[PDB]
């Protein structure tokens, strides 16, 4: 797994789970969603509702303050988003939609209107029209070709053309079709409900050639100059012709995408065949069938695929990259097929983590930082974790099902909250489509508006974290960390927390500076670790540890991997305006990195308390580690305590980048996150405490922890807000 999942709820920082500026247009979104890049370098998001009666638009980089527009439709489209198109013509979002009754609706939405404050819209922003009789021959797929021309596909197998004469009116330009004549055979009828070989995917090549994929997996190719069938390939008669079962595709989906003159096609054989040839002159020429690596019966459905230029992956042997998004229920799967060379015979499948760190930690009870105790403490915890949109949707579902909080301390209620919150989140995060943010940034758009998932290329350390129970090889450092995790994973959460606390205590002086390091480690050991682990695992850890050259590995870990670089500014494109998207993506990514760092650092420190490692030789490392552990803890605490505030102080930390950043590739993003890491390990805490004072229970531990004169003051006032206050 070379990529990780970073989840983004664009409204997370704000209390209102809805933008104040929402406008409802009417014509006389949890079923499809996508992003589209516009002339102004902005991404517009759109959602088509379950019923296909509501279309919603909102600006990716300004969801809360920007305008979201709901366009209400008189009836549903004939066949969902598949009978809908959206393209930017000239400073306008042109949207066409064949409705159920047969009408062909046109929408014209000025770009300005999409980024204005206005709640009104002038002029003819919509046109109804009946160019063809769709009662008899029902369409199911609408494909945009040009501002004036676009084709319609029909359920029975026929194509209709649609040519724009003036600015509004459309007329049918019919294609010659003699396929139907297979009705003459005893094996097909015109009247039969089966037998249809309708189009399920379609792409435009060089403005002129129209490549269509049919339900029987025929690749037909139409020349729009001639309006004539030029090619007809049977994709299946190439590979092992299975007489048992080839699943004729029973719905429109994303079964092909082309880059330059290459073309991948998705064929169903255990839902596992990526054919890919080349287009050239028109001739399609096969190269290879690349199967999938999917098990659990192979029960994943394609959501979206995107063939494109190669990424910066851990195998330099690369020529092209296919990004692939599967789904199974609300569970998703992101993979990248890397093809090495111009022969499509050498390739490699690259998997990714399909759950975010926060989620994995919550599931596997690996979260050490989140404060325990009170029921209302848990309330703040979940509220802060999930965001208001989810938390309130969950409280809605609770009261609907007649689950009502008995009293202040109803733990039985909170229990229910955990799950409903998780489920709501999971639902909201159901995958719908892929967007290539920037040049190469893999973005997934979810069913619930304001919910996106970015898939981020992992750094070295992140790859180690995410592949402990996998990596066959690995460097010495990986193996060392792996063995440390091998021991530490046997300890329980309470023990680990008490140890973390003690490491804070060394810094706060609660473990007096008067003590030697050895004495503090002995204290820690006796109070926290003694009788709390199996001696067999200790022996194991010691043995494995003796194979390593510890000073070197620790050197590489501390001074290269974990301690970031001095920058002479390496272009983190300065944002002119606040970008809520990159803001939350940055904060979540930072949180993942520092969480991983935290777990490593703690495991190493643990090894320093357990064994007789010369406290003088490693003194430098020990104190650096305790400093880093301390800073990590602090940051993570502030993160789950008040994300908005943290973001605000962490971006008002960098002067030249006060408004935020833009990143168009993975390198710029990684470098920016690293930059923030640097900020943390080296003004934030002050701006945060200040803005906060102008999260009460918080800064008690965080004036016991994050305090260690000013600290006394803060403790004295937060405790006034009484004997302790006056005394201090």
């Amino acid at each position, epitope marked *: 797994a070379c990529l990780s999942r970073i989840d983004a709820n664009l409204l997370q920082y704000y209390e209102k789970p809805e933008p104040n500026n929402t406008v409802d247009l009417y014509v006389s979104g949890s079923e499809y969603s996508n992003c589209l890049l516009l002339s102004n370098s902005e991404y517009i998001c759109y959602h088509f509702s379950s019923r296909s009666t509501l279309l919603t638009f909102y600006p990716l980089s300004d969801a809360y303050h920007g305008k979201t527009i709901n366009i209400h439709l008189p009836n549903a489209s004939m066949n969902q988003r598949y009978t809908l198109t959206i393209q930017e013509v000239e400073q306008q979002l042109l949207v066409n939609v064949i409705l159920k009754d047969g009408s062909f609706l046109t929408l014209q939405l000025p770009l300005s209107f999409l980024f204005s404050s206005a709640n009104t819209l002038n002029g003819e922003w919509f046109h109804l029209q009946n160019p063809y009789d769709f009662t008899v021959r029902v369409p199911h797929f609408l494909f945009y070709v040009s501002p004036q021309f676009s084709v319609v596909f029909l359920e029975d197998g026929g194509l209709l053309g649609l040519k724009k004469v003036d600015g509004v009116h459309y007329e049918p330009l019919l294609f010659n079709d003699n396929s139907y004549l297979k009705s003459l055979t005893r094996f097909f009828s015109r009247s039969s409900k089966s037998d249809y070989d309708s189009v399920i995917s379609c792409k435009l090549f060089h403005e002129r050639y129209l490549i269509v994929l049919t339900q029987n997996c025929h690749l037909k190719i139409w020349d729009l100059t001639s309006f004539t069938l030029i090619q007809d390939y049977d994709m299946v008669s190439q590979s092992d012709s299975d007489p048992s079962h080839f699943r004729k595709v029973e719905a429109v989906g994303e079964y092909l995408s082309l880059y330059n003159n290459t073309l991948v096609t998705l064929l169903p054989l255990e839902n596992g065949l990526f054919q890919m040839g080349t287009l050239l002159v028109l001739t399609y020429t096969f190269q290879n069938n690349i199967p999938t690596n999917l098990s*659990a*019966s192979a029960i994943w459905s394609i959501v979206d695929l995107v063939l494109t230029r190669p990424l910066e992956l851990n195998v330099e042997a690369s020529y092209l990259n296919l990004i692939v998004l599967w789904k199974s229920g609300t569970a998703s799967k992101l993979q990248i097929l890397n093809v090495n060379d111009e022969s499509f015979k050498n390739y490699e499948w690259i998997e990714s983590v399909n759950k975010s760190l926060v989620d994995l930690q919550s599931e596997h*009870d690996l979260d050490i930082v989140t404060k325990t105790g009170d029921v209302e403490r848990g309330f703040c915890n979940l509220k802060s974790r999930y965001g208001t949109q989810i938390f309130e949707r969950a409280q809605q579902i609770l009261s609907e099902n007649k689950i009502i909080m008995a009293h202040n301390e109803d733990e039985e209620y909170l229990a*229910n909250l955990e*799950t409903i919150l998780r489920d709501v989140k999971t639902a909201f995060n159901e995958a719908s489509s892929i967007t290539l943010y920037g040049d190469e940034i893999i973005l997934v758009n979810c069913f619930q508006p304001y919910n996106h998932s970015l898939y981020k290329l992992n750094t070295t350390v992140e790859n180690w974290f995410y592949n402990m129970h996998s990596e066959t090889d690995g460097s010495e450092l990986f193996k060392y960390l792996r063995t440390l995790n*091998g021991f530490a994973s*046997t300890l329980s959460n309470d023990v680990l927390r008490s140890i973390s606390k003690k490491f804070l205590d060394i810094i706060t002086g609660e473990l007096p500076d008067s003590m030697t390091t050895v004495e503090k480690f002995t204290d820690i050991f006796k109070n926290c670790l003694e009788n709390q682990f199996e001696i067999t695992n200790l022996k*194991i850890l010691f043995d494995e540890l003796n194979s390593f050259d510890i000073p070197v590995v620790l050197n590489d870990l501390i001074n290269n991997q974990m301690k970031p670089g001095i920058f002479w500014k390496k272009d983190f494109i300065s944002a002119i305006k606040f970008d809520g998207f990159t803001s939350i993506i940055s904060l979540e990514s930072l949180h993942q990195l520092l969480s991983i760092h935290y777990r490593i650092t703690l495991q190493v420190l643990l090894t320093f308390v357990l064994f007789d490692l010369d406290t003088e030789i490693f003194g430098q490392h020990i104190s650096t580690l305790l400093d880093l552990h301390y800073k990590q803890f602090l940051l993570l605490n502030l993160y789950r305590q008040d994300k908005c505030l943290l973001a605000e102080v962490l971006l008002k930390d960098s002067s030249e980048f006060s408004f935020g950043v833009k990143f168009f590739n993975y390198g710029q993003l990684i470098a920016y996150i690293d930059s923030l890491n640097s900020n943390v390990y080296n003004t934030e805490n002050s701006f945060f405490m200040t803005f906060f004072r102008s999260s009460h229970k918080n800064i008690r531990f965080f004036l016991e922890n994050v305090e260690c004169e000013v600290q006394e003051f803060m403790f004295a006032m937060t405790l006034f807000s009484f004997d302790q206050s006056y005394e201090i």
Partner: antibody
Amino acid sequence: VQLVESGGGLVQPGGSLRLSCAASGFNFSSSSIHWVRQAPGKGLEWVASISSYYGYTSYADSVKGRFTISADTSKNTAYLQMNSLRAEDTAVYYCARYMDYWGQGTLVTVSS
Amino acid sequence: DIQMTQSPSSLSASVGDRVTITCRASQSVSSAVAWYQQKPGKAPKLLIYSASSLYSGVPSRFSGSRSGTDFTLTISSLQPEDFATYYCQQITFGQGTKVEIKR
């Protein structure tokens, strides 16, 4: 793919038995081997596991100090050495790996 | 030690009936919960892992879900080959739900 379990049977109480579980058709060296037992007419009881990958072992309270789990990666074989056996230890023991792959199980009678 | 309760301890149902088996954790285990089916005289077969993931090859009539500390195994349409003892698991196991084909 198949686990194999040999070495149970009848054993006098206070006595000893070594169970073997010979594995194949998966990566033994990165798997975890568990031993799970079922007393006549009762439910499943997890007693022990070992990480091939790091040797890490652990035990249910009911068997700690009497049972030793071990593993030889070079013959893809794991072991459970059972000492000071008790009537409470009769049952059928399985061997599972992580639990996707299960031993056909071998029955251990402690009595006389 | 964690205690996994199951309810009911023994149920009975028609072929084609929808069957619900519940499991309650003594403490609060996270979604680290698996469901197994055991025929008598044979090794348990994994059905569900991570509370709601369907294990490879298992019929889709079996599903798992969670509500707080309550875990649910559902058989959407009971078949005559489905009589068995079903177990939840977090390591500790449930006491075991025994189903048969009600008459």
